[PDB]
């Protein structure tokens with residue numbers, strides 16, 4: 001059973017802007033996703049300070065970057081707190097309506113797309129490079145779910161029957177045909193070094 005939902009209008013508008021605006025500095029998507037993973041990792045770590053059993057679903061806190069040139073996907077995996085079904089539906093655990101409004105207002109005033117993270121909606125920068133994004137997630141005591149959208153105003157949510165994750169979130173970027181540079185080891189390394197040097201969890205770049 002797959003449920004299909006409409007994005008709030010403001011979010012659909014932001015996604016369209018991201019997809020259709022000319023902007024060459026697309027590499028910022030990766031910093032935003034790694035930042036999100038870091039925040040989710042902070043949260044499970046904090047909760048584990050008073051309830052160690054929350055780590056029964058996995059003690060290692062890290063981020064993996066997995067390029068697949070055959071499938072044309074870049075996958076970012078973390079072992080953070082994970083999202084519930086409600087989190088996914090409610091704009092991936094974010095106050096995206098108010099964030100997206102302010103961001104589009106700032107862009108009107110002369111801000112640039114790279115500042116998206118300041119408005120709490122950095123996730124949507126994924127659409128700079130991806131034609132479709134799948135988010136697979138698992139929170140303690142809830143089921144594993146898959147969220148997916150190719151923009152166009154809607155997203156789906158379903159119970160995921162793929163490889164079980166202990167706990168955390170996997171973001172699978174199905175890259176646009178002209179954005180395969182983000183599957184190359186040296187390019188990814190460059191971006192991580194430039195934008196994510198002070199992330200406090202191990203980031204492992206898989207090779208093929």
Ligand SMILES: CC(C)c1cc(-c2noc(NC(=O)C3CC3)c2-c2ccc(CN3CCOCC3)cc2)c(O)cc1O
Nearest residue numbers: 033036037039040043080081082083092093120123169
């Ligand atoms: C799909 C995006 C949004 C995403 C979410 C999570 C995640 N898993 O559990 C979570 N649940 C959370 O509560 C974690 C934040 C602690 C999150 C999460 C949700 C929203 C944000 C965006 N923030 C939200 C607030 O404003 C700044 C950006 C970051 C991570 C993640 O680990 C990686 C990601 O790329």
